[PDB]
């Protein structure tokens, strides 16, 4: 369970990282259609 907790936290940060980056890219892509 202590290893479980840790791999949860590692993947949760990765994911959060990835979603912010995709929100930024999503904005750029919407702009650049114009």
């Amino acid at each position: 369970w202590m290893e479980w907790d840790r791999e949860i936290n590692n993947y949760t940060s990765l994911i959060h990282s990835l979603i912010e980056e995709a929100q930024n890219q999503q904005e750029k892509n919407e702009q650049e259609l114009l």
């Binding site: 479980w4 949860i8 990835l18 750029k28 650049e32």
Partner: protein, 36 residues
């Protein structure tokens, strides 16, 4: 280019959510066994 790049970003998020799903599935079977 920004589109191929977004698809990378989503693929990567999907992969990382898959890891999380295998971790919750694991956690559930452990609780299940302890409960048994």
């Amino acid at each position: 280019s920004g589109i191929v790049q977004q698809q990378n970003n989503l693929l990567r998020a999907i992969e990382a959510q898959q890891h999380l799903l295998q971790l919750t599935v694991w956690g559930i079977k452990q609780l299940q066994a302890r409960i048994l």
